[PDB]
Symmetry: D3
Subunit: 327 residues, 6 copies
């Protein structure tokens, strides 16, 4: 697997960013881990915490093609986690979200090919499946680009895969942590936008690991989807602090009732496995790939024609307590 390799991750100062740097640091022999991002304050703060010579911090934007080409020189593997993810903000700053996510993905793809990187994994989201909001629309474009990149074939081959998973239990500005800062500062209530608000749930750590495993499976072109549990927002408001009331607030700008992981119209392209899924590409590559046998010799089978992985039509569900056991 990974050994004496160089890894560059865009937006490595983010949640997935550090939780991933940490895990690669501790569980692998990655010769050098490179964080590529824009803020000097987070990288100054992040260099002092990860006080290890295995690191290296490059200040740069993904909207910058030259910089990326410079930053990716000599890199072996690349994880793309840079992005504007705040759905409401994206609705008010649509070009900003487009520049960062779409153009950003394109430049990363380019710089990777030029530097002959070996493997690239971009981070998607369930919001990119049958999307309604801008953020998701841009992300779907990003996935489309990354999958399509597997067609280029220069004097250097590069595999481009995508990992798509749900809401990361408690993250920089989320819900579960929000539903505590309140009760702490005397929360007058517990706002619940709706009773049907379902959502796939995964942890920072579960995510970081499904990624490092995809690298071990991937042929390039796949869109790996993990089989994660769903949790009714009704049974979550409880845990967090049933005590206080729950003033319904309606619906934020761009929210869905439930999130989709694998569209119904994607069924055919799906292949079930044990812990995960794979949404085979839609286009054909000059060099065909057999997405039925991972590079880990794991065998996967198709799915029923009327297949779809909704957040609610799911069968797994996080007990109204389990999320406290995780807190």
């Amino acid at each position: 697997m990974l050994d004496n390799q160089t890894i560059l991750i865009t937006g490595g100062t983010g949640s997935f960013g550090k939780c991933f740097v940490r895990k690669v640091l501790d569980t692998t022999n990655a010769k050098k881990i490179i964080v590529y991002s824009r803020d000097e304050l987070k990288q100054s703060e992040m260099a002092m915490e990860f006080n290890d010579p295995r690191m290296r911090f490059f200040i740069g934007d993904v909207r910058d093609l030259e910089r990326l080409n410079y930053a990716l020189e000599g890199v072996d593997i690349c994880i793309h986690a840079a992005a504007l993810k705040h759905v409401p903000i994206a609705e008010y700053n649509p070009l900003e979200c487009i520049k960062t996510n779409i153009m950003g993905a394109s430049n990363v793809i380019n710089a990777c090919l030029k530097n002959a990187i070996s493997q690239v994994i971009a981070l998607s989201t369930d919001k990119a499946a049958n999307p309604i909001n801008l953020y998701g629309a841009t992300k779907l474009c990003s996935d489309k680009l990354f999958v399509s990149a597997n067609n280029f074939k220069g004097s250097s081959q590069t595999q481009f895969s995508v990992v798509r998973y749900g809401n990361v239990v408690g993250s920089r500005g989320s819900v579960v942590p929000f539903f505590k800062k309140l009760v702490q500062n005397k929360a007058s209530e517990i706002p619940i936008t709706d009773i049907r608000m379902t959502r796939f749930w995964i942890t920072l750590d579960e995510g970081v690991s499904f990624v490092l495993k995809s690298l071990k499976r991937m042929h390039g072109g796949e869109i790996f989807v993990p089989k994660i549990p769903s949790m009714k927002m009704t049974d979550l408001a409880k845990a967090l602090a049933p005590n206080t009331p729950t003033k319904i607030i309606g619906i934020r700008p761009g929210e869905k009732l439930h999130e989709v992981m694998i569209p119904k119209d994607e069924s055919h392209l799906a292949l079930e496995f044990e812990d995960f899924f794979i949404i085979q590409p839609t286009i054909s590559f000059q060099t065909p790939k057999d997405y039925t046998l991972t590079k880990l010799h794991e065998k996967g089978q198709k799915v029923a024609p009327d297949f779809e992985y909704s957040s609610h039509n799911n069968n797994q569900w996080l007990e109204p307590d389990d999320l406290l056991k995780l807190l």
Copy 2:
């Protein structure tokens, strides 16, 4: 008596299906100062100036990907129709940045330019595929719509209005399938492509839409996404039409090709406002200057819709008999 009296109109990509018809319909039914055709191809542009040979026409070579050009293009324009785009779904799947550069950046430039020149009203053309999309093409179009709607916040003494008209397939449009169904049974009728037996699609006429735009243009406030109520046509039947009897062949689902097109999402119904013959999906954001979309600028009143409604082609009420289409062919 509402009209586009003595006005300069510019339509991007008006060298194709929608464009040629809209350019014809406007010259015929309205008295607009002039009409500018903005497109890249010199052949089509030349074979259009002849085709029309009308003094109220002007032709500009140009790419929507070009901002300095669009800036000079729109100079002196009152109304802009954005119909330029890459719509060939499977090709968009293989050439994703192309589709992105034209449809996403393209929409952005047309906007940037329209505002610079203080255009009055702008209507952008979307597709049913931009609703809960799954193919790249549709995803760029969803982005596109978002941009034009978001464009309504900008507040300068320009006050441009941006709206979107989203509808489905056009009964035999510039190289599609209807003609590619004749074209075949119009040569060696013995093999007809198919994908599914449940495969449905909304079908509007290359004219029902054109007029729908001119109409949406007359009753807009800005920020709307007008949806024309149309009939759904299950493919199977659409088969016996362009070939009463022939050995059809079930090829395969082309890349990124859905199975049931959505016109209005299930998760956005709370934004829709039903009307007698059309729909209006209100902005998912709030503008500085709010508006009551329940009242078209034509007075037309509107009531919302069932909090669960999902205007899908399959769950459509009306349909088209394999003869109602013959009455189109």
Copy 3:
């Protein structure tokens, strides 16, 4: 010659475009033929007609440098036929014509060098010789650039030559076909701008072949000119449909009486051959070339000091019938 090679042709959806793709398909072992152009409707229509796995369609503009670099990866030979050729339109859209033809030629030249292509042939026109209209002015710049490209010398050598020939008998929006669509739709007349209107004439097929032969001759830097026949526009109006009258119409915007192939002031740089000519470069290359012995061991001699290849001062002439035999 060409074998197991990859060929990319800009504007391959055009007249010369398909007639060339077809001929390479049928007469060579070209491993892969790549069409590079902007319209999806022509490439969708062109893929279904040339239903052959030897093809590959890239949607792109020549005004786009990144795309070209991507498109030319792994290509062996490149034919440049993309361009805005409508003279009147170019007079009203001068920057458009300049961007496409000049900047377009420059980007193609660049992408070719970066990808180490071996041979590049750009298509010129007689309108580029002692030009008067914009279209021709841009084309002369394109020829100048391509010839000059033979001076670059990186870890990869690339030959850049130009093929310059006249009006292609009946083409997408021309005269001879125009002078029939009329008589068909009851042509009231036959418009003849002038009695001296001479023009070199060649066929789509003759052109496509002189190109594939130049590749076999070329050293890089030459501007091959075929010896084609001239035809008085007076004796052409006849054939097409003498029947109807000929309402003289004057002179279109930018038209010449006759077209030049090899300028008088180019004499010195000329070298006569059997079927063709060669207009040796004006500049000297780091690595001299002997344009007297093609790579086909064909020997050519200079021309008289007062030499010039006008369309009228020519000696060959297409009988007022021959063009019907060709129709």
Copy 4:
């Protein structure tokens, strides 16, 4: 009494031959608010501010290839003289994109900028070499002229006028041959470069032209290409001048160097309009606002020319005795 009263003038590349003279001529004979010199080189610009030391001067460092800069440059200008360019023919042959970037894109930016700032009149400098060209330099200049003339269509409340002044060699200009003929017989007279015995060229004075511009500036409508009637000087004679007797040497025809310069094409004569001391090649296209180029804005009337006319240097009527030039040296 026509003047450039209290006006701001900006000349691109006015740090060279034409520029320095025009800058001098305008300060001396007219009362224009100010004069802006726009060029790249700091040395020449500094050695010019001293050289002139005039308060009505302003110097801006800048490349015509730079659009944002040109935009700030022309801000507040009424008249623009575009004299910036790469004219060294053989060098242009070896560095074709350079010449292209400066002469073609350069002309485009100066235009884009002039219109943005609503400049009143713009005169661009062309060369005889842009007539039925064969060298790159001249070909960029033909493109250039086309651009400035085409620039007259644009219709905004700016109404800028764009014209072109095309003439030949300037009797001993910034490093040419006349001085490089002295410079030699001005050191070791024993070897003089030559190309042909029929080699002819039009010759105007670095002052006859400058004034011709100021004049063309006073009688323009826009879209014209003014041609100054000048004398032709067969090289041979021009030899005995800058060296009565010396062993000249026939080197060789430099790259892209013609043998007979054309001022007006044979295929464009039908556009020319002959005048007492100059010519006017009318646009090869039609503008929205037509104009009668037969009447200079100075009332000067004009009759066309013989439908075959080809103002060539060799077929020129007047010439220059090997002493008329001495009366220039």
Copy 5:
């Protein structure tokens, strides 16, 4: 009664130290129509809209490196505060183009945009490090200041005024050392970083400065570089403060880190104009419209300074007792 009455203010990078405080101070003490926060990070922007939850706020995602965006940003703004920047000296040393792209090109775009939108007054934030600099960061800031001052020449009916406010360290600002001195003795007090025993620095309060800007904003003409008179605090003492007693450790001089910060150069004193509580370094160039910087727009008179003066931190007169800082902490 001077105020920023009913005015739209936009501050670049107002999502950080200075910004948040300035945004707070202005809302609290003045009645300005609205306030626009222009920055790149969505997290900080969201955690600020909540943090403030004030209707007179607006947040725009954006990079100062982006000119088209800045152009739309500043649209409709009267006053602009440029506080966006990369200031982490040693990081700037390792990523020099980054710092350059943001601080140099960044300042240029904010200017280009401000003029385009006819902003009234613009104040740019500089640092003491831009005085006789040696580190990249400070060198970009010197360039930066030069740009904003030079920006005062441009003369269009816009008449924007550009000034600069340059001061030193901010007593415990967004991750610096003061807090990183607590943070340590606030966990395992046994090792404190040090560089020299002569190491001095000027120290102003994150509030003394903010107000200084609002004040400099009220008494500016344009082209000035306002310098606030502040106290110097020799580091040694600053040590016993954030840790009465602990085993400090002399690590090493971080890259590009000076030893004595300069507020006013020795070679520029002849430009300074001393005031009761501040300084004004006049432009090193002459503008078309001269100004008497000896008279603030607040009437405040000013006398120059000793022709040798060099406002250095070490040669400072006033200082701060290791308790005056405690009275800050």
Copy 6:
């Protein structure tokens, strides 16, 4: 040392430009010397004077990245002397100076890495030390960039060093030559801005040689400073023409009393040698370098803590005559 190498120098039509081309031409076996600059008139004039096939003139701007990449193909060593150096003009055209000097330096750095050049020497100035004027501020950024470039490490290594020296005795538009053109044209006076105006002095030739030697010493990352003499402007006005009076004129826009070569706060990073100095980098390179032993096995030692190389606190001084002996 240098042999069969290719050298490209930006702004080779300048003072240092020709004096360097000449010296490399005469004292080395440089296979090919390439001049890269913008003006055709200087390069036309410069090709005729340096009438040697070892030359090659490329017309280009440093503000142009493509061109540079083209121009630097196959180059071994690169000297960067292009720049806007007129301090007053830079104060009025600050963006022009920034584009040329800073962006220019960045593009040169980029093109060099892409072409795998081996060594690059950029020319600094004493004005970049503790600067006050724009010109110097941009130059300090240029030095910072060049030093930092030594961190990139692609499939090709490139050393980037800087040479920083004072006013070049009599140059295109300077003082000493100015103080003669006057007396020649009847100089009414001798303007002396101040009595303390000190300045380091070096010759075109001394400079050109310290450069060619640095190439022989350099490890990459150094900022070589030669130990040159200082001259009081009071004792210089004399020589030039004591005869005429000396009307004091004040202080130009951006001038200092004295110029610094090695800042006081740079002491620690300094290393004294015989004829020169070295200001070790401020940052650490992935691959450490020992700046105490040049590549010429020359040993250098540090300097006292209170060290600084001012133009006045200097000990060497050019006799009020020596500059006439040099004239």
